[PDB]
Design a binder for these strands. Structure first.
Lengths: 75, 145, 185, 64, 187
RNA sequence: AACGAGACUCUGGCAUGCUAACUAGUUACGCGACCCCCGAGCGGUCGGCGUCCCCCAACUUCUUAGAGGGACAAGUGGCGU
RNA sequence: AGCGUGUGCCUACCCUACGCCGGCAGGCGCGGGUAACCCGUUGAACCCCAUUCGUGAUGGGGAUCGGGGAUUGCAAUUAUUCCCCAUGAACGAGGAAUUCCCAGUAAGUGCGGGUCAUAAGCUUGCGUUGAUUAAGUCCCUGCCCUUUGUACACACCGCCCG
């Protein structure tokens, strides 16, 4: 029997990584951000809306149960 | 973030400063989901923030509202002690005060030896339930002699 | 972590294992001398004669001795058998396992030095000294337990290489706390 | 040591076999030589003119 | 003009079936191109009628399964829709090619029948190969999602991508390579 | 030769063909009324929306329910003393 | 959505629109219906669209138990039923065994009728969303027909030896 320990707010070692990792991923989604950065799904939802208003990522699709985002139109 | 304090002590009980404020204060006995929302609504606190994001004067505003509901216009029909049998008051009872209020109620029934007080003393079901087939907590007994 | 030189077991030799579940075609099992890797025993490989119940040949969480009948290196597939194993080979399996569990109980404790943040330190401490102390002797059949017994009677074994003081003392103690009753015979 | 895959076409269905009627018994013709035909047992639903994939061609079976 | 139907967003004409035993049983292209994987058709009424159902609807039927999900077909159409959108971002390829190749790799071609712990090896028919493939990859997607922040739309995409290359990380490839190992010992 | 089986009785799916309805509706207009200009084009004859309202208009597609109709292994290809 | 019920003939009770008072259960006033006419275009649940939570026995689960308020009744304590604040158990897909099912079916989902002064976790009907697997066999448990053997007819759960 085991436990995760996901963060509720950022710190600079993980917030600078959020801004550096943007071009690396073909698929951007709250769950893949959560497991890869060790972040709660509600912080992953909030972080991906900021990058969209900064113009750094493209929204592919939205629905109640599933958002989808991708890299900024090249590569 | 501010790296602020993320565990805090409120009424001789510990609150995790890591849940949403309306679900952190329900760690106090006598404060359910329904009552915690109404207290924060009278206290003028935004429900969107984490419990470690409240300032020192914001927690004192919530604590002073929980202990005196009737002066901040929380209704009488909301409260968990109504016309208390010995002195006729209306209030909400919290923390270690709720333990003692039940402790006094069970002894008050036992002293006059009413049927409720005897069922609580013998350890049986107090409300109307049957006892032939449910609530079993002993051991299997064999038929052999 | 691994207890041995190599990533995967070799064919037609005996390993110590622990049973995790039972299904329609076989039992699923974790190998113990390797890093808990998956393998399976087929229900046809349990006995030479009729089975009255399966639960008294195998049950979950018990340790067991089996041969490896087939391996595929690329996909990581291992097939196991019990019909094959003679009781001398089961005693030999318990000796290999005891000689390995004692050495691992030294190295796992000696690793609690420097930063110790990752299993990288366990694999780095297993390599060099403990690995070169028995890679040379796989065919004769010794393990690093015998090199540690030589290092107890003369530490020149340890002085021949890059070294740590827990790696000296914990190694010596896990022999000497049991060997000091060198009694009358 | 190793042998290749072979493909064969169903030319007739002969009946059903096994303890509960589970397997169809069938005649198949190899697609590399139209003269070569054999009998096989098949687990699923089968129809005339289906193609089977054989992991060994040299084995042949009668009534299990 | 009406001879080409894009299934909302995805073309059928560029798709290929590379195993000649399955071309009759994987329904794609021509009269089997539709706008949505949902019809009220009477496919149960005769023995081989099942083979005329479009393969994306057969995946949609087999997904509305596990007790709490019986009859909920409108929820199950959007799972397939959002899985195909994730497959196109990861691979850059047509989602219908990924589904067809996952079905061609996942169906077992030898198996052993039961006769008394005792078994005998037998051949598997092309209709049972396509039936087995769908059930295995739906089961693989269903077991991985059960306690993870991953949605079932992400798990169904991961399972189809791993099956289309035969990686042995998928549930369907491990189970196929177990059935053919056991049957090879019962010759 | 007799009973059981089957036939028989109720029920489901089809009829723009029949009979005929203010305790069931539709369409249309003498028209009448509210709202919008989005419409060729105006605030209109003409357009859009209505369980908003009369007909001493026409009718039975949708609802009700009486009479009849229809399916027989009847047609075409194989297999069967 | 579809199937139904409605002023009780001794026997004394029915189904409800609309307005006003109350957080709620509920209360007062005033109309229609002995019913294709009134409740009623029977604004049903799952489902559908948007939000919040984040793998934690958790905002999953709701047993157990304290205090207060209405309604039926001649009478409610061994709590009739209903409403409100509080308390917050076991339980992480279940051992040997074992039941039902082949198409608008299984399973999911809610609504009428019966019993009823008060009241379904039962049962008997109705609609709505809607699959996977088979088109076979006599292996297991049984049924039908024929040939055959018998020391059985209380009929194999029979009869009988030291």
């Amino acid at each position: 029997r085991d436990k995760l320990n996901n963060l509720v707010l950022f710190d600079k070692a993980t917030y600078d990584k959020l801004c550096k990792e943007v071009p690396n991923y073909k698929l951007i989604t709250p769950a893949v951000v959560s497991e890869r950065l060790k972040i709660r799904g509600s912080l992953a939802r909030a972080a991906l809306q900021e990058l969209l208003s900064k113009g750094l990522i493209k929204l592919v699709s939205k629905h109640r149960a599933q958002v989808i985002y991708t890299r900024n139109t090249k590569g | 973030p501010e790296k602020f304090q993320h565990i805090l002590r409120v009424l001789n009980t510990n609150i995790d400063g890591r849940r949403k404020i309306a679900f952190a204060i329900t760690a106090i006995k006598g404060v359910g989901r329904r009552y915690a929302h109404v207290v924060l609504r009278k206290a003028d606190i935004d429900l969107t923030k984490r419990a470690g994001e409240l300032t020192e004067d914001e927690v004192e505003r919530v604590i002073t509202i929980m202990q005196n509901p009737r002066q901040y216009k929380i209704p009488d029909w909301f409260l968990n002690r109504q016309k208390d049998v010995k002195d006729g008051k209306y209030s909400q009872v919290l923390a270690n005060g709720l333990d003692n209020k039940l402790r006094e109620d069970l002894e008050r029934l036992k002293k006059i030896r009413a049927h409720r007080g005897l069922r609580h003393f013998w350890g049986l079901r107090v409300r109307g339930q049957h006892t032939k087939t449910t609530g079993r907590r002993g051991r299997t007994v064999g038929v052999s002699k | 972590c691994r207890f041995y030189q190599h990533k995967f077991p070799e064919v037609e030799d005996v390993v110590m294992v622990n049973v995790r579940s039972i299904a329609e075609m076989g039992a699923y099992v974790s190998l113990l001398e390797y890093n808990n890797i998956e393998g399976m025993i087929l229900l046809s490989e349990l006995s030479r004669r009729r089975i009255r119940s399966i639960n008294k040949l195998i049950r979950i969480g018990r340790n067991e001795c089996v041969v490896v009948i087939r391996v595929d290196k690329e996909k990581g597939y291992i097939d196991l058998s019990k019909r094959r194993v003679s009781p001398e080979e089961a005693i030999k399996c318990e000796d290999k396992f005891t000689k390995s569990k004692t050495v691992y109980s030294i190295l796992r404790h000696v690793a609690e030095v420097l930063e110790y943040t990752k299993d990288e330190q366990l694999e780095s401490l297993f390599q060099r000294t403990a690995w070169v102390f028995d890679d040379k002797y796989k065919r004769p059949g010794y393990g690093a337990y015998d090199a540690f017994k030589h290092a107890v009677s003369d530490p020149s074994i340890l002085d021949s290489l890059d070294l740590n003081e827990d790696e000296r003392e914990v190694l010596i103690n896990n022999i000497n706390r049991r060997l000091t009753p060198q009694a009358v015979k | 040591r190793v042998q290749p895959i072979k493909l064969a076409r169903v030319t007739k269905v002969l009946g059903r076999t096994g303890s509960q009627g589970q397997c169809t018994q069938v005649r198949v013709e190899f697609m590399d030589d139209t003269s070569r035909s054999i009998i096989r047992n098949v687990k699923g639903p089968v129809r005339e003119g289906d193609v089977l994939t054989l992991l060994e061609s040299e084995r042949e079976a009668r009534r299990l | 003009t009406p001879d080409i139907k894009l299934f909302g967003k995805w073309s059928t004409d560029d798709v290929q079936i590379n195993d000649i035993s399955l071309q009759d049983y994987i329904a794609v292209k021509e009269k089997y191109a539709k706008y949505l994987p949902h019809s009220a058709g009477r496919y149960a009424a005769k023995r081989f009628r099942k083979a005329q159902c479009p393969i994306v609807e057969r995946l949609t039927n087999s997904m509305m399964m596990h007790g709490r999900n019986n009859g909920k077909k409108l929820m199950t159409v959007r799972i397939v829709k959002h899985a195909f959108e994730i497959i196109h971002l990861l691979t850059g390829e047509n989602p219908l090619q990924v589904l067809v190749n996952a079905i061609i790799n996942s169906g077992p071609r030898e198996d052993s029948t039961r006769i008394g712990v005792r078994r005998q090896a037998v051949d598997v028919s092309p209709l049972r190969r396509v039936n087995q493939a769908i059930w295995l990859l739906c089961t693989g997607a269903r077991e991985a999602a059960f306690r993870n922040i991953k949605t079932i739309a992400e798990c169904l995409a991961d399972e189809l991508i791993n099956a289309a290359k035969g990686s042995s990380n998928s549930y369907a490839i491990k189970k196929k390579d177990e059935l053919e190992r056991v049957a090879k010992s019962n010759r």
